[PDB]
């Protein structure tokens, strides 16, 4: 009988909700009530990566701060110089529909995918001098949304089939499945460390994932809404999370629950992206609104806007050195912001 | 020497937006369509020397609201309708109303045109119980029916198509456009009604519409 | 987290009424469209009608105009559909499914077979 199975699991739900209001005594907006503000964050359009055809989805640093490479659903991977804003390589793609793109720590490889199901390694150092493609990674039976590689032979994918996967690259085989999600998982971010990743999926909810083991250690609850974005804090500790409800949220691993949301009236556009500046207090987000809000991650004041896109804000991204923010739109530009 | 190399990476940045250039053209002179009915079916037909791609998604889940933002930019979409006529209604209300798919247009092929001739006589279930206002409904006097068919399939043809229009005309402000067919040569209907598409949105960049 | 629970169903024989409430918590209910969807046995799932977001639009499949009622109650957070004069072929499992996004037109994926904002849902049998 799954009824009483059903009635269990809400007594289980029942009980981590109070182990959770127990540990709640404090919020994280009366610890920073006593801190100084930022401030305004006023940054400026430092570059403008022009080349691109259609619109952008996805856009990767490179571990350098320097180079990075875009994907527009033209059918282009084009990696740039963000200094000099030349163009480096155009990659252009079996599959036009593309909806992620990384690129390795190393720097020798670039990975994208998107409606074709498949994930798609590009090596950038062949000995001949070309972009060729060295492996295409196949066994989701949905889109991929997103993509981080571990290192030059392991790369973690997440889909539109609720599920995420670890491949090994050399084989070219699925070594773990990561299930759980009921919804389109949309976003992974990996930990400092890599040893664990967080997933947002379409059903509000977000799950923290130990790589070598390949079970769910934690499943973080508090959206309305689909989350379409996920990034650690950069200690590790934390992540922060945006939702098509309109807000940003702050979870924490170790206390296992929500911290703050970044949220306001005016705003009722989805977040389509977040990062956390270089040492946590930035909290950057793209909208649909065309716009990036700044958000003060401690205090949840906003602190600034980025308002120099025509189209949706669909990636963002900050460089490791926490020079410079990047962001990608529909109308088809990056801009550097600092 | 560093101006040595920043001059090699000006020589190679000139070869890739030569390329592009090459690309742009390619690209603008394609006309792409999403066909709703591994992980996508890619279709190349040509009419009149346009090129059309036509992409018809495969293997993805039943839960279209985050994939089917990728088609905002497609020329038009490819509507085909076989109670799953109201699951199809649900369907182009929610493509209609979209934010993201507000400025696309939707070819729809009220397919089936001979099924719906041979279910209406005396098996009619598809239109008669899932709408009783059908019951109450004349077909339209302007209606162009085809030389020689029932004068009950040419009802139900133009009472499904008017179902469908009800939805376009709320809501329609003059930036996407519905193309209703099968009521009355699908290329060359798709081939029409994207120049037809095309047309309308030189105009208004023209503010002539 | 978001919650649908749904209550009221149960045996009724034909031409006999009754009331099926939904309790949402989770979400701010006035942000968003509200549906029945209803899976009849052996078929799929298949959408009844739904209510805007204050409750102005309303809409019903052809089937149950004029025999059904949806209303919904912004304050207590609860949605309702009033079945009047139930015909045999009414028997489904009921589902209260919540629209996908606050403050949109469309509403997607309601009757897809695996949607998470939508409820256990409750047996009517006619």
């Known amino acids: 009988e799954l009824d009483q199975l059903r009635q269990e699991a809400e007594q289980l739900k029942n009980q981590i909700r109070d182990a959770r209001k127990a540990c709640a005594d404090a919020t994280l907006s009366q610890i920073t009530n006593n801190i100084d503000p930022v401030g305004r964050i006023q940054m400026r359009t430092r570059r403008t990566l022009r080349g691109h055809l259609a619109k952008i989805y996805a856009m990767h640093w490179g571990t350098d701060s320097r180079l990075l490479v875009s994907a527009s659903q033209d059918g282009k991977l084009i990696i740039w110089d963000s200094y000099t804003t030349n163009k480096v390589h155009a990659i252009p793609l079996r599959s036009s529909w593309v909806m992620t793109c990384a690129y390795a720590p190393s720097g020798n490889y670039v990975a994208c995918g998107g409606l074709d199901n498949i994930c798609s390694i590009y090596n950038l150092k062949t000995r001949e001098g070309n972009v060729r493609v060295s492996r295409e990674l196949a066994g989701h039976t949905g889109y991929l949304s997103c993509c981080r590689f571990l290192d030059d032979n392991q790369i973690v994918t997440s889909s539109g089939d609720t599920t995420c996967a670890l491949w090994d690259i050399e084989t070219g085989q699925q070594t773990t499945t990561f299930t759980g999600h009921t919804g389109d998982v949309m976003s992974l971010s990996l930990a400092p460390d890599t040893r664990l990743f967080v997933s947002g999926a379409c059903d509000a909810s977000a799950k923290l994932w130990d790589v070598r083991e390949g079970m769910c250690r934690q499943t973080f609850t508090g959206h309305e809404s689909d989350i379409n974005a996920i990034c650690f804090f950069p200690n590790g500790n934390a992540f922060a999370t945006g939702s098509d409800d309109a807000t940003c949220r702050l979870f924490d691993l170790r206390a296992d629950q929500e911290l703050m949301t970044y949220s306001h009236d005016n705003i009722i556009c989805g977040i389509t992206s977040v990062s956390f500046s270089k040492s946590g207090r930035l909290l950057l987000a793209g909208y649909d609104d065309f716009n990036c809000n700044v958000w003060d991650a401690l205090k949840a004041d906003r602190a600034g806007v980025l308002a120099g896109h025509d189209n949706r804000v669909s990636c963002l991204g900050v460089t490791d050195d926490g020079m410079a923010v990047a962001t990608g739109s529909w109308d088809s530009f990056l801009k550097i912001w600092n | 020497d560093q101006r040595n190399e920043e001059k090699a990476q000006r020589e190679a940045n000139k070869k890739i937006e030569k390329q592009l250039q090459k690309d742009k053209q390619v690209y603008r002179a394609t006309h792409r369509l999403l066909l709703l009915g591994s992980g996508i079916f890619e279709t190349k037909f040509q009419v009149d020397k346009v090129n059309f791609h036509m992409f018809d998604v495969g293997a993805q889940r039943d839960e279209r609201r985050k994939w089917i933002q990728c088609f905002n930019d497609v020329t038009a979409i490819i509507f085909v309708v076989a109670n799953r006529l109201q699951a199809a209604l649900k369907l182009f209300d929610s493509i209609w109303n979209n934010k993201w798919l507000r400025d696309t247009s939707v070819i729809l092929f009220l397919n089936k045109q001979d099924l719906l001739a041979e279910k209406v006589l005396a098996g009619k279930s598809k239109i008669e119980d899932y709408f009783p206002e059908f019951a109450r409904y004349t077909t339209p006097e302007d209606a162009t029916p085809e030389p020689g068919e029932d004068p009950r399939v040419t009802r139900a043809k133009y009472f499904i198509r008017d179902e469908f229009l009800r939805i376009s005309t709320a809501s329609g402000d003059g930036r996407h456009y519905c193309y209703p067919h099968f009521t009355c040569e699908n290329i060359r209907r798709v081939f029409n009604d994207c120049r037809d598409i095309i047309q309308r949105m030189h105009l208004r960049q023209y503010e002539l519409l | 987290q978001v919650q649908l629970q749904e209550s009221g169903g149960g045996l009724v024989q034909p031409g006999g009424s009754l009331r099926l409430s939904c309790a949402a918590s989770?979400?701010?209910?006035?942000?968003?469209?509200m549906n029945w969807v209803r899976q009849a046995p052996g078929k799929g799932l298949e959408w009844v009608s739904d209510i805007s977001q204050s409750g102005a639009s309303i809409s019903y499949t052809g089937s149950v105009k004029g025999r059904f009622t949806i209303s919904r109650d912004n304050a207590k957070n609860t949605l309702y559909l009033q079945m009047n004069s139930l015909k045999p072929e009414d028997t489904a499992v009921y589902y209260c499914?919540?629209?996908?996004?606050?403050?949109?037109?469309?509403?997607?994926?309601?009757?897809?077979?695996?949607?998470?904002?939508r409820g256990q849902g409750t047996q009517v049998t006619v």
């Open positions: 499914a919540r629209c996908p996004a606050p403050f949109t037109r469309d509403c997607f994926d309601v009757t897809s077979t695996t949607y998470a904002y």
């Open positions: 989770g979400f701010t209910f006035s942000n968003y469209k």
